[PDB]
Scaffold this active site. Structure first.
Site, PDB file in Angstrom:
ATOM      1  N   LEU A  14       0.758  -1.103   0.128  1.00  0.00           N
ATOM      2  CA  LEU A  14       0.025  -0.073  -0.028  1.00  0.00           C
ATOM      3  C   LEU A  14       0.916   1.152  -0.074  1.00  0.00           C
ATOM      4  O   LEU A  14       0.569   2.049  -0.691  1.00  0.00           O
ATOM      5  CB  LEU A  14      -1.048  -0.106   1.143  1.00  0.00           C
ATOM      6  CG  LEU A  14      -2.032  -1.257   1.065  1.00  0.00           C
ATOM      7  CD1 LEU A  14      -2.712  -1.443   2.589  1.00  0.00           C
ATOM      8  CD2 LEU A  14      -3.138  -0.804  -0.178  1.00  0.00           C
ATOM      9  N   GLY A  15       2.041   1.320   0.589  1.00  0.00           N
ATOM     10  CA  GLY A  15       2.979   2.246   0.590  1.00  0.00           C
ATOM     11  C   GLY A  15       3.800   2.283   2.170  1.00  0.00           C
ATOM     12  O   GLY A  15       4.054   0.948   2.477  1.00  0.00           O
ATOM     13  N   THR A  16       4.448   3.077   2.443  1.00  0.00           N
ATOM     14  CA  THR A  16       5.328   3.212   3.388  1.00  0.00           C
ATOM     15  C   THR A  16       4.782   4.143   4.494  1.00  0.00           C
ATOM     16  O   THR A  16       4.352   5.153   4.374  1.00  0.00           O
ATOM     17  CB  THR A  16       6.904   3.770   2.884  1.00  0.00           C
ATOM     18  OG1 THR A  16       7.219   2.858   1.967  1.00  0.00           O
ATOM     19  CG2 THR A  16       7.780   3.546   4.260  1.00  0.00           C
ATOM     20  N   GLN A  18       5.587   5.076   9.298  1.00  0.00           N
ATOM     21  CA  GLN A  18       6.773   5.510   9.985  1.00  0.00           C
ATOM     22  C   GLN A  18       7.385   4.449  10.402  1.00  0.00           C
ATOM     23  O   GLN A  18       8.694   4.597  10.649  1.00  0.00           O
ATOM     24  CB  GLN A  18       6.220   6.265  11.160  1.00  0.00           C
ATOM     25  CG  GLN A  18       4.647   5.842  11.733  1.00  0.00           C
ATOM     26  CD  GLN A  18       4.132   6.906  12.777  1.00  0.00           C
ATOM     27  OE1 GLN A  18       4.627   7.819  13.377  1.00  0.00           O
ATOM     28  NE2 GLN A  18       3.138   5.926  13.492  1.00  0.00           N
ATOM     29  N   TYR A  82      -9.053  -1.840   6.738  1.00  0.00           N
ATOM     30  CA  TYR A  82      -8.443  -1.000   5.283  1.00  0.00           C
ATOM     31  C   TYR A  82      -9.119   0.100   4.875  1.00  0.00           C
ATOM     32  O   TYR A  82     -10.537   0.002   5.211  1.00  0.00           O
ATOM     33  CB  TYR A  82      -8.734  -2.631   4.467  1.00  0.00           C
ATOM     34  CG  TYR A  82      -8.312  -2.172   3.005  1.00  0.00           C
ATOM     35  CD1 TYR A  82      -7.153  -1.885   2.442  1.00  0.00           C
ATOM     36  CD2 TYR A  82      -9.354  -2.185   2.025  1.00  0.00           C
ATOM     37  CE1 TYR A  82      -6.776  -1.590   1.275  1.00  0.00           C
ATOM     38  CE2 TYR A  82      -9.031  -1.834   0.760  1.00  0.00           C
ATOM     39  CZ  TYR A  82      -7.953  -1.523   0.257  1.00  0.00           C
ATOM     40  OH  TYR A  82      -7.482  -1.234  -0.909  1.00  0.00           O
ATOM     41  N   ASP A 127       0.153  13.133  17.005  1.00  0.00           N
ATOM     42  CA  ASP A 127       0.888  13.224  15.678  1.00  0.00           C
ATOM     43  C   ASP A 127      -0.491  13.470  14.521  1.00  0.00           C
ATOM     44  O   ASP A 127      -0.489  12.716  13.396  1.00  0.00           O
ATOM     45  CB  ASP A 127       1.788  12.233  14.992  1.00  0.00           C
ATOM     46  CG  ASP A 127       2.559  12.635  13.821  1.00  0.00           C
ATOM     47  OD1 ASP A 127       2.447  13.911  13.420  1.00  0.00           O
ATOM     48  OD2 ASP A 127       3.562  11.957  13.412  1.00  0.00           O
ATOM     49  N   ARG A 131      -1.943  13.710   6.616  1.00  0.00           N
ATOM     50  CA  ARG A 131      -0.958  12.371   6.058  1.00  0.00           C
ATOM     51  C   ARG A 131      -1.319  11.317   7.041  1.00  0.00           C
ATOM     52  O   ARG A 131      -0.986  10.036   6.617  1.00  0.00           O
ATOM     53  CB  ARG A 131       0.537  12.778   6.083  1.00  0.00           C
ATOM     54  CG  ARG A 131       1.104  13.256   7.454  1.00  0.00           C
ATOM     55  CD  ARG A 131       2.472  13.170   7.598  1.00  0.00           C
ATOM     56  NE  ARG A 131       2.763  13.603   9.061  1.00  0.00           N
ATOM     57  CZ  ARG A 131       2.646  15.086   9.261  1.00  0.00           C
ATOM     58  NH1 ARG A 131       2.299  16.077   8.567  1.00  0.00           N
ATOM     59  NH2 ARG A 131       3.025  15.216  10.544  1.00  0.00           N
ATOM     60  N   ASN A 132      -1.683  11.369   8.276  1.00  0.00           N
ATOM     61  CA  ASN A 132      -2.086  10.495   9.319  1.00  0.00           C
ATOM     62  C   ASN A 132      -3.634  10.143   9.496  1.00  0.00           C
ATOM     63  O   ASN A 132      -4.067   9.546  10.572  1.00  0.00           O
ATOM     64  CB  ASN A 132      -1.573  10.950  10.587  1.00  0.00           C
ATOM     65  CG  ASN A 132       0.077  10.674  10.796  1.00  0.00           C
ATOM     66  OD1 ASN A 132       0.709  10.056  10.076  1.00  0.00           O
ATOM     67  ND2 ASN A 132       0.760  11.546  11.633  1.00  0.00           N
ATOM     68  N   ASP A 145      -3.034   6.023  13.364  1.00  0.00           N
ATOM     69  CA  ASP A 145      -1.729   5.809  13.894  1.00  0.00           C
ATOM     70  C   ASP A 145      -1.812   6.904  15.319  1.00  0.00           C
ATOM     71  O   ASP A 145      -0.802   7.634  15.521  1.00  0.00           O
ATOM     72  CB  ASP A 145      -0.667   6.427  13.119  1.00  0.00           C
ATOM     73  CG  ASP A 145      -0.277   5.472  11.639  1.00  0.00           C
ATOM     74  OD1 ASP A 145      -0.404   4.274  11.925  1.00  0.00           O
ATOM     75  OD2 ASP A 145      -0.051   6.060  10.769  1.00  0.00           O
TER      76      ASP A 145
HETATM   77  C1  LIG Z   1       1.394   6.947  -5.802  1.00  0.00           C
HETATM   78  C2  LIG Z   1      -0.340   7.249  -5.395  1.00  0.00           C
HETATM   79  C3  LIG Z   1      -0.889   6.267  -6.361  1.00  0.00           C
HETATM   80  C4  LIG Z   1      -0.781   8.686  -5.739  1.00  0.00           C
HETATM   81  C5  LIG Z   1      -0.347   6.876  -4.135  1.00  0.00           C
HETATM   82  C6  LIG Z   1      -1.471   7.533  -3.301  1.00  0.00           C
HETATM   83  C7  LIG Z   1      -1.682   7.391  -1.836  1.00  0.00           C
HETATM   84  C8  LIG Z   1      -0.710   6.426  -1.302  1.00  0.00           C
HETATM   85  C9  LIG Z   1      -1.268   6.182  -0.147  1.00  0.00           C
HETATM   86  O1  LIG Z   1      -2.323   6.193   0.729  1.00  0.00           O
HETATM   87  N1  LIG Z   1      -0.174   5.767   1.154  1.00  0.00           N
HETATM   88  C10 LIG Z   1      -0.034   5.371   2.449  1.00  0.00           C
HETATM   89  C11 LIG Z   1       0.495   6.199   3.269  1.00  0.00           C
HETATM   90  C12 LIG Z   1       0.308   6.091   4.690  1.00  0.00           C
HETATM   91  C13 LIG Z   1       0.621   4.572   4.999  1.00  0.00           C
HETATM   92  N2  LIG Z   1      -0.103   3.652   4.042  1.00  0.00           N
HETATM   93  C14 LIG Z   1      -1.348   3.177   4.461  1.00  0.00           C
HETATM   94  C15 LIG Z   1      -1.442   2.775   5.777  1.00  0.00           C
HETATM   95  C16 LIG Z   1      -2.946   2.275   6.203  1.00  0.00           C
HETATM   96  C17 LIG Z   1      -3.663   2.047   5.084  1.00  0.00           C
HETATM   97  C18 LIG Z   1      -5.105   1.300   5.292  1.00  0.00           C
HETATM   98  N3  LIG Z   1      -5.429   1.422   6.574  1.00  0.00           N
HETATM   99  O2  LIG Z   1      -5.623   0.822   4.535  1.00  0.00           O
HETATM  100  C19 LIG Z   1      -3.510   2.314   3.757  1.00  0.00           C
HETATM  101  N4  LIG Z   1      -4.211   2.118   2.697  1.00  0.00           N
HETATM  102  C20 LIG Z   1      -4.357   2.489   1.291  1.00  0.00           C
HETATM  103  C21 LIG Z   1      -3.136   2.946   0.654  1.00  0.00           C
HETATM  104  C22 LIG Z   1      -3.130   3.082  -0.786  1.00  0.00           C
HETATM  105  C23 LIG Z   1      -4.285   2.751  -1.684  1.00  0.00           C
HETATM  106  C24 LIG Z   1      -4.184   3.087  -3.135  1.00  0.00           C
HETATM  107  O3  LIG Z   1      -3.882   1.655  -3.558  1.00  0.00           O
HETATM  108  N5  LIG Z   1      -4.344   3.894  -3.492  1.00  0.00           N
HETATM  109  C25 LIG Z   1      -4.524   5.344  -2.771  1.00  0.00           C
HETATM  110  C26 LIG Z   1      -5.713   6.088  -3.667  1.00  0.00           C
HETATM  111  O4  LIG Z   1      -5.194   6.335  -5.099  1.00  0.00           O
HETATM  112  C27 LIG Z   1      -5.146   5.095  -5.730  1.00  0.00           C
HETATM  113  C28 LIG Z   1      -4.157   4.185  -4.937  1.00  0.00           C
HETATM  114  C29 LIG Z   1      -5.382   2.313  -0.642  1.00  0.00           C
HETATM  115  C30 LIG Z   1      -5.474   2.090   0.580  1.00  0.00           C
HETATM  116  N6  LIG Z   1      -2.202   2.957   3.480  1.00  0.00           N
HETATM  117  C31 LIG Z   1       0.133   3.915   2.579  1.00  0.00           C
HETATM  118  C32 LIG Z   1       0.091   5.579  -2.193  1.00  0.00           C
HETATM  119  C33 LIG Z   1       0.092   6.016  -3.357  1.00  0.00           C
END
Ligand SMILES: CC(C)(C)c1ccc(C(=O)N[C@@H]2CCCN(c3ccc(C(N)=O)c(Nc4ccc(C(=O)N5CCOCC5)cc4)n3)C2)cc1
Length: 263
Positions: A14-16, A18, A82, A127, A131-132, A145
């Protein structure tokens, strides 16, 4: 509280976060989950594992739900609800979306309800920022968080003079004395409201953390975003009083927000 890793499915990243990489997965072959990997050496684990019991009991519809933890093996995992639309900051910045002033207030109401719930249980976020915060498939914003910054081992995040410390969301008593209270979360909520109404602008853009801390000391604050009305600006500005005592509670904030959406 303890989830067997045999009851999890690890899938796409999903990403990165802390403490490291966050993955999407399935729990007990049925539920969507966010699996947060805690890199070995990033967290004070023994202290987190005790508070995780208290956090398990924090349950509100505008709070990202903690489902459990995997601690029998390293690296440990935090299993959560999620949130299909991800990060609130990225969601505000997405040009595909056209937010109505009414939807921006509704986002503030969402965060405020979760924050009033945390305040009611004497639990500090420490925090709070866009972003959180996370967004679900329905466009509902939830706070994430909460109380995790306490267990971060990296001093650059932890010290009020560190390059990673959240200075732009911090009141003067936090910047100067590390004095955290429900009133320091109130300040952060006002900055978060500005983030929503400015559509994801970075607060104090063209200021460094040292200059921001100095701007605040001079009694200066974030300007009114043009999508915010006078009444919406009075609400976020009330969060930024020099005296922590003169700043509202999340109950007063929710009532004020509900009053302006009636108007
Ligand atoms: C590059 C792009 C597509 C712009 C991007 C946009 C947003 C991000 C993002 O949300 N990153 C975060 C930061 C915080 C920690 N991370 C966490 C922590 C907890 C959750 C959770 N409880 O489900 C979560 N969920 C998602 C994270 C991404 C998505 C996803 O596929 N998307 C985001 C919206 O556009 C389409 C693509 C869906 C759920 N992410 C990852 C990652 C990438």
């Amino acid at each position: 509280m303890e989830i067997d890793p045999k009851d999890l499915t690890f899938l796409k990243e999903l990403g990165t976060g802390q403490f490291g990489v966050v993955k999407y997965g399935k729990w007990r072959g049925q539920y969507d989950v966010a699996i947060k990997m805690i890199k070995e050496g990033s967290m004070s684990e023994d202290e987190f594992i005790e508070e995780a019991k208290v956090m398990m009991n924090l349950s509100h519809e505008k709070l990202v739900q903690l489902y459990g933890v995997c601690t029998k093996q390293r690296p440990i995992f935090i299993i959560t609800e999620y949130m299909a639309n991800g990060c609130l900051l990225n969601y505000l910045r997405e040009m595909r979306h056209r937010f109505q002033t009414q939807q921006l207030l509704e986002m503030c109401k969402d965060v405020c309800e979760a924050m009033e719930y945390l305040e009611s249980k004497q639990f500090l976020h420490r925090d709070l920022a866009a972003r959180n915060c996370l967004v679900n498939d329905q466009g509902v914003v939830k706070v994430s968080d909460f109380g995790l910054s306490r267990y971060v081992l990296d001093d650059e995040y932890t010290s009020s003079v560190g390059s990673k410390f959240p200075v732009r969301w911090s009141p003067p008593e936090v910047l100067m004395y590390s004095k955290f209270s429900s009133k320091s979360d109130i300040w952060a909520f006002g900055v978060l409201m500005w983030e929503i109404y400015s559509l994801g602008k970075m607060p104090y853009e063209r200021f460094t953390n040292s200059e921001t801390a100095e701007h605040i000391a001079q009694g200066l604050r974030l300007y009114r975003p043009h999508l915010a009305s006078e009444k919406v600006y009075t609400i976020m500005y009330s969060c930024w009083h020099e005296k922590a005592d003169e700043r509202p509670t999340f109950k007063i904030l929710l009532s004020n927000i509900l009053d302006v959406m009636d108007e």
